[PDB]
Structure 1
Amino acid sequence: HMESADLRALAKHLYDSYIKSFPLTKAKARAILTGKTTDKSPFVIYDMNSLMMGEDKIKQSKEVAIRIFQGCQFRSVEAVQEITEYAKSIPGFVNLDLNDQVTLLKYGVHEIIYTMLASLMNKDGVLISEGQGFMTREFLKSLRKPFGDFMEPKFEFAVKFNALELDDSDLAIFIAVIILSGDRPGLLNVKPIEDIQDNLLQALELQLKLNHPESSQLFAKLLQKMTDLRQIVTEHVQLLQVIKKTETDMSLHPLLQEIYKD
């Protein structure tokens, strides 16, 4: 459909914007996690005592599980802002009907947050504070009530997603494909969204073949991962609903508040 020279151009464009939009890349996260460096090592939070020191080292007086939860939402709000900025760079997105732009972001940001959170994860924990900290999976799993169960499904996905060994240039196109989904509820003009997604899919297909030439059917394996993404988002909102019934003492950021309607 599109000449390969044009598909390579689209990949370069999107990769360029991804670097401009997202401060902590997968390449940087892997350098921090795999060590070999003395200037990039994170402070590790694994228990109540190391958390207390972490607030002093890495530089709102409530229960611990609460404090950590609000820390996540703060970062999620930032991610939404970064993702919104990235989507405006996707060719054709800002030319869509304005209601559809909103609709695509509303149902797209969480699937992308989960995708990109995997970059910050290994089987034992997750980078935080722009990579200055690292909080262990075990510590997250041991938080009380429903909060302990919140964090773990992210990890089971990440371990599976990370086995695909995608780099940032692959992820930049995958993320674009997620945003331009014509099956979001309430879309007004499905067809121009599908046309954009077709080009992005072509670009993702060629990128994955060139960048992982010994990785057979990686394109198909990557698309199937959108199953896993859909299931965790559902688990996530369902757990939020429980919290929005036990903890009437707290609420969400207006941006998250509006995202989670319908």
Structure 2
Amino acid sequence: MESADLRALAKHLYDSYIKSFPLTKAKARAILTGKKSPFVIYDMNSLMMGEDKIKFKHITKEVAIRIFQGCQFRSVEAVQEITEYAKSIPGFVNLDLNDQVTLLKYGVHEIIYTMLASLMNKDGVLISEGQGFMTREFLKSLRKPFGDFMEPKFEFAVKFNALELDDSDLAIFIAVIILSGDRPGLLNVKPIEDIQDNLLQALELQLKLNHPESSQLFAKLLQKMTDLRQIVTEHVQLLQVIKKTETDMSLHPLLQEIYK
């Protein structure tokens, strides 16, 4: 590829990434630092006032369940956002339809965790397009398996955010995740890896121009995909504990199907 083409590909993805995702990293960092202040959830009572404040649809019997299920609601929303962005990656829509489904089926969890760090600091997480803020303290302190469902995400995000990537970096990074040629059941891997080679090239040039003073940031960011695979697995294994433990969770079969 030629450098001018990698600049063009990077700009393409950044523009799409902004249109696809409601709350950008740049905007989220403005809210967390205090630069319109969000509503803060730190305990039982402020949660009760919050679902009365903005009427969170993710939030509205037991508290720890309602919070867990609110993550699912927002996760379903996010999957669709990623699916739209995926269509703007040059070459993606020309792939075999089964392979498009396969790449998204397996990539979304890694991409959600990555983008969830954009909404997080060491003390909590933004919610509802940045109008809320749920504290790490409150999440960590939830009961039984829910307390320890939330804390691993924060632990990844604090390390990941130490890289100080911006939205133009992340757009290419997320694209690289989607075009992973090692997902189970892919029919035609060659054109997928061909796109990933171009995206990898663009990420490399992007990180060098946008962080010239950061030695081997490219390599350091590819090593975070090691983390991602591990956390996604830990995440999956945790869901199956709730399914086989919680008699409270049985919901509406239709909702169950939406969240399948």
TM-score using structure 1 length:
0.93
Does 1:48 pair with 2:47? no
Q: CA RMSD in A?
A: 2.1
User: CA 1:122 to 1:246, structure 2 compared with 1: closer, same or farther past 3 Å?
Assistant: same
Relative to structure 1, the CA distance from residue 251 to residue 8 in structure 2 (aligned partners, 3 Å threshold; closer, same or farther) is: farther
Contact preservation (8 Å) 2:39, 2:133: yes
Q: Aligned in 2, Cα 1:190/1:258: closer, same or farther, shift over 3 Å?
A: farther
1:249 counterpart SS class: coil
Structure 1 residues 28 and 146, CA gap change in structure 2 (3 angstroms): same
Structure 1 segments unaligned to the other structure (5+ residues): none
The count of residues paired between Structure 1 and Structure 2 equals 255
Q: Is the 8 A contact 2:76 2:259 kept in 1?
A: no
Offset at residue 251 of structure 1 (A): 5.8
Cα distance between partner residues in 2 of 1:191 and 1:252: 42
Query: 2:125 aligns to what SS in structure 1?
Result: strand
CA distance in 2, matches of 1:214, 1:136: 33
**How big is the shift at 1:165?**
0.2
Partners of 1:73 and 1:252 within 8 A in 2: no
Change (3 A) 1:230 1:252: farther
Q: What aligned pairs does 1:218-233 form with structure 2 within 5 A after superposition? A: 218-233=217-232
Q: Deviations over 1:39-61 (max 9, x none)?
A: x2111101111111112222xx7
CA contact (8 A) 2:72 2:259 kept: no
Q: Is the 8 A contact 1:173 1:200 kept in 2?
A: yes
Cα 1:209–1:258 shift into 2, 3 Å: farther
Cα displacement (A) at 1:66: 0.9
- C-alpha distance in 1, partners of 2:27/2:252? 28
Listed one character per residue, the Cα deviations across residues 100-120 of structure 1 (whole Å, up to 9, x for unaligned) are 000000110000000000000
Change (3 A) 1:258 1:67: closer
CA distance in structure 2 between the aligned counterparts of 1:256 and 1:180, rounded to whole angstroms: 30
Query: What SS does structure 2 have at the residue aligned with 1:126?
Result: strand
Distance in 1 between residues matched to 2:226 and 2:156, nearest whole Å: 11
Q: Provide closer, same or farther for how the CA distance between residues 240 and 255 of structure 1 changes in structure 2, counting only shifts above 3 A.
A: farther
For residues 92-148 of structure 1, the C-alpha deviation after alignment (integer angstroms, 9 at most, x for no partner) is 111111110000001100000000000000000000111011001110011111111
Question: Matched residues in 2 for 1:5 and 1:17: separation?
Answer: 19
Secondary structure, aligned partner of 1:79:
helix
Identify if the C-alpha distance between structure 1 residues 222 and 49 changes in structure 2 by more than 3 Å, giving closer, same or farther: same
Question: Which range moves more in the overlay, 104-113 or 46-55?
Answer: 46-55
For the structure 1 residues 48 and 118, does the alpha-carbon distance in structure 2 shift closer, same or farther, using more than 3 Å as the test? same
- Sequence identity percentage: 100
How far apart, CA to CA, are the structure 2 residues paired with 1:255 and 1:229? 30
Q: Secondary structure at the match of 1:23?
A: coil
Deviation at 1:247, TM superposition (A): 2.1
Deviation digits for residues 186-211 of structure 1, max 9, x if unmatched?
Answer: 11111110000000000000000000
- Quickly say closer, same or farther: Cα 1:259–1:50, change in 2 above 3 A: closer
Q: Output the TM-score relative to the length of structure 2.
A: 0.94
Instruction: Give a deviation string over 1:154-176, Cα, whole Å, max 9, x none.
Output: 00000000000000000000000
In structure 1, distance between residues paired with 2:114 and 2:183: 18
**Distance in 2 between the 1:152 and 1:113 partners?**
15
